[PDB]
Every structure is written in structure tokens, then in C-alpha cells.
């Protein structure tokens, strides 16, 4: 019936965004409280009753075959997912901050000296994936596998993807081969299994999915989430992304390309891998 | 006054477009029984109003709560409701392609198959650039110039997009055109225009940052491939608001100076495209 609280006073706006209509907000209530607010997706059903029926409407501009309105419909199209923090902490303060990006071109020399240091200093934990490797987590949930320990790989579909329509088709090959870290360590050595995952991969998704390769983007990531080499295979409808087949055309065309030439992506504005390149870039 | 929409009893036909992420949808329905085209889109909120609802006792039902969190649905009044509702009647076959979802495919266009396919198939469409030698020349547009290097070889102009409005920095959306003519796109550009690339990132940078206080680290700044109209120019947008970066492009010409000549691009087209089908059957 009532909020845990009593009393709202907006301190900060957290985060926003005009397109996916969200808002996060900290406000001051009684201690700290976040409150996101969330404006839902249409029903086809419930929209198609409303126009048959009366609208209240308020026209904002009108000419010839065009005119936009103010629709106000009843209550039950006008529902807002709302999530209540409180107490709200620091942590929930900066968790949804709004990412604040700045881009980074990263020379090979970069990676060597800055970027690569500082990613073995962090000791960051990749056995879940030698469990999925190892069928000791998620074996039930794969699509496809090619078994060879150095060219081979395995195709999982997302957690989120339901499978139940391919408009958010979505999955991932993880390579069998250990040690390959990202993008950056790739050379001609792996030009078979980065061509099987493109290949393989594409006729088991058209196989089990009747999703032709026309169909979906095939790409990695740099900067990585995670530092084992791992593949996106995403439907078409669904400076970070670089697409297979360019991977291995690079490979092909200039055997070095990865660890000579320059990356560009994006990294947090208090991420501590950025402050330690702009100070060796300048 | 409370308008009532131009026609009478709407059947659904067909949903044209929709999309959860955005919270819009695009509807096909008959009326008078001509066609018709809806479109619903829920309004993003305005802090004022959320924080007022918040102080006072909004009308809420829980779905669940663990300890700390809590998740409720609102029904907020009337003010926050709004929906924004464009109406298209008497609807066209035209504008019903124009709202349906794209029904896109991947290609990828060897070095060969933009001289033997693409090129000659842009070329038979005999589509008119002169708007854009008309704001080259200061015959249109020159009040929306925000910065120029006037040199005719490695020279550009600097537009703003006509849907930015200048007031937040969150879609910064900027223009490049430049000054030199006949270069149709990227698969034109050699290393004999490596100084106009350079011009326009650095130049075009600078220019943002004395104009809108804009550091380069926010901006991404690419072109198109395919792109919209066969005159070189290059997108500057944040990065708070396919592509191919500046940057990289004048590094491979550094690097490969046949780079845009020889090697294959990928992009996507609409399944319609004759474009599309002439590209698949030369590789089939």
C-alpha cells in the first residue's frame, strides 16, 4: 500500500535515459533510498481496444496526413515498475551511477607495458569457464561442441535468451584452448579455430535454429568482460565490437596485426586501467 | 479542446514495429470500414513531477521484496501518463514499408565487387548531391556552420545535425563535410587524402572543444559504410548517445595504402535492396 518510508527529497539524479524511459533518483527519506521508476512496454491487445474506444486525446501539432497527440489512457496502460532501496547505501549509490565513458586508443606498445601488467596485478578468477569447459557447469545447455582441445569449442546460448524466438537470437562460443586472453593474443597459429567457430558455428545455428549466416553478426569484444577468448553470435535485429571474419582477415593479411596496431574502446571515467594510460600517453 | 482521432473504429491488422527496450509501437489498422498508422510511445519522466509522487502516497501494489529491495507496480496520476501518439490517415503503401520493422542481411563487398557491382549500381541511381555543394558554397545552411576550414583539397565544414538542438551535450550529433569533391565514401579514400582525414579529426575535434567544452576522449568520431549519400562525411557524436573510426581508417592507410580498394567490408542491407540481390548473385 505505502513506500517502507515517509517523506521524498531528491538529492541527486542517478541516471536517465529518454529512449528506454528509466530514471534512477537518490533521495533523502525520513535515511538514503533509491527509487528507479520504469515506464512499461505496450500490449498489442490493450492498445487496440483503446483506439476502437474514445481516446482522451490533446493534439500538440496537426498538418495534412500527419498530427501527434496527447494520449492519456486508463490505468491499467499506465503501470511503472518501481524498485525501492532503503536503506540505500554508497555502494547502491555508485552501482547505479550512470556510466561515465571515456575513449581510449591503446598502441600495442600500451598493452605490452600498461594494459597487460595491470590485468595480471588484478588475479582475476577464469575457472568458471574451465568448468563449462569441463562439463562440470552448463554441459545440459549446449548447442553444439567441437572437442579438439586446440581448434575446437563450445557454443552455449545465453541465459537470457529464451530461445522461443530468434529476434534476440544470442549466444557465445568459448574456445577449448587455454591461454588465449583476448583479441590482443591472437595470431595466424589459431586461424583454424577462430575459422570453425565462424563456420561450425554458423551451420549449427542454421541447423538448429534455421537462422541463416546472413542473418546474425559474429564478433569479440576488446576489452573483454572476461580473459578467455570467447565469440558473440547475435541476430542482426538485437568501438568495442570487431567482427570474425575481419579477425581473420587481418591474420591473414598481416600476421602481427594484434599485437602491433591500435585498439580503441571505451572504459569507465574512474576505471583505474584508463588514469594509468592517459599518464603513459602523456 | 478533447480531439477525437480523424477516423472511426480501429481494426488491427498488423503490428508494423515494436520494441520493449523503447516502450513504442507502431500499428497498421483499417478505419472507416482506408489504412491508418498509430504510433504509441510512453514519455520519458520528468524529475519534478517523480519526486513530487513520491513525497505524497502513490498508488502502489507489491510484487516482491528481498529485505532491502522492494518492487512495486505505480499507477501515478494523470500527469505522468502521457503517451505520445502519432496518427498517419489516410495511410499510403508507402508509409507502411516506411514504420515496418527492417528486414536486414549481411553482405560482405569484396574489392572486385564494388568496382563490378556496387559502383556501377550507385551510378545508374543518378542520385542529386547538389544540396550538399549548396551548403559547401554558402548557398544554403551557412548559419548552421559551426566551424570551417576553408582549404578547397583538405578542407571541411562542421554542421550540427537538424535533430540536435545544442542544449545538452548527452546527444552531441555533428556533421563533417568536406570541401573536396568526388570522393563517394570510404571505398574511395587513399593515402592522398590522408591530410583532409586528419584535418577533420583533429580540426573537428578542437572546434567541438572550443564551441561546446567537449573533450575528443567524450566524442566518437566515424563514417559510414554503406553511407546515406556518396559525399564523404564524417559523424562526431558522444559517446553517451555499420561504423568505421577516423582513426583507424587513417591508421590502415598509413599502413595499407590499397587498404579501401582491396579488402572486403561488411554491411547490412534491407532483403529488398536490389543492391542486395545483385551482390548475392555475383558471389553465388
Redesign the interface.
Given at each position: 500500500?505505502?513506500?517502507?518510508f515517509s517523506?521524498?527529497?531528491?538529492q541527486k539524479?542517478l541516471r536517465?535515459?529518454?529512449?528506454?524511459?528509466?530514471?534512477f533518483?537518490h533521495?533523502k527519506v525520513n535515511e538514503d533510498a533509491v527509487?528507479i521508476?520504469e515506464?512499461?512496454?505496450?500490449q498489442?491487445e490493450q492498445?487496440?481496444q483503446l483506439?476502437?474506444g474514445?481516446?482522451?486525446?490533446?493534439?500538440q501539432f496537426s498538418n495534412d496526413?500527419?498530427?501527434?497527440?496527447?494520449?492519456?489512457?486508463p490505468?491499467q496502460?499506465?503501470?511503472?515498475?518501481?524498485?525501492?532501496?532503503?536503506?540505500?547505501t554508497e555502494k547502491h549509490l555508485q552501482k547505479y551511477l550512470?556510466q561515465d565513458?571515456?575513449?581510449?586508443?591503446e598502441t600495442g606498445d600500451d598493452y605490452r607495458n600498461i594494459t597487460l601488467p595491470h590485468l595480471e596485478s588484478q588475479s582475476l578468477s577464469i575457472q568458471w569457464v574451465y568448468n563449462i569447459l569441463d562439463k562440470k557447469a552448463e554441459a545440459d545447455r549446449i548447442v553444439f561442441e567441437n572437442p579438439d582441445p586446440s581448434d575446437g569449442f563450445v557454443l552455449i546460448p545465453d541465459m537470457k535468451w529464451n530461445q522461443q524466438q530468434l529476434d534476440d537470437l544470442y549466444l557465445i562460443a568459448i574456445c577449448h584452448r587455454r591461454g588465449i586472453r583476448s583479441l590482443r593474443d591472437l595470431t595466424p597459429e589459431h586461424l583454424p579455430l577462430l575459422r570453425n567457430i565462424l563456420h561450425q558455428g554458423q551451420e549449427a545455428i542454421l541447423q538448429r535454429y534455421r537462422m541463416k549466416?546472413?542473418?546474425?553478426?559474429v564478433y569479440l569484444h576488446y576489452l573483454p568482460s572476461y580473459y578467455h577468448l570467447h565469440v558473440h553470435f547475435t541476430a542482426?535485429?538485437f568501438?568495442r565490437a570487431h567482427?570474425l571474419?575481419?579477425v581473420i582477415?587481418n591474420l591473414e593479411?598481416?600476421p602481427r596485426h594484434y599485437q602491433q596496431?591500435?585498439m580503441?574502446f571505451?572504459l569507465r571515467a574512474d576505471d583505474p586501467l584508463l588514469k594509468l594510460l592517459q599518464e603513459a600517453q602523456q
Open positions: 500500500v505505502r513506500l517502507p517523506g521524498f527529497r531528491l539524479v536517465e535515459s529518454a529512449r528506454d524511459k528509466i530514471i533518483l533521495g527509487v521508476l515506464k512499461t512496454p505496450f498489442v492498445v487496440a483506439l476502437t474514445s481516446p482522451e486525446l490533446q493534439l496526413i500527419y498530427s501527434t497527440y496527447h494520449l492519456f489512457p490505468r496502460l499506465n503501470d511503472v515498475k518501481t524498485t525501492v532501496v532503503y536503506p540505500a550512470r565513458l571515456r575513449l581510449i586508443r549466416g546472413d542473418h546474425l553478426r542482426l535485429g568501438e567482427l571474419a575481419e582477415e593479411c598481416d596496431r591500435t580503441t571505451a
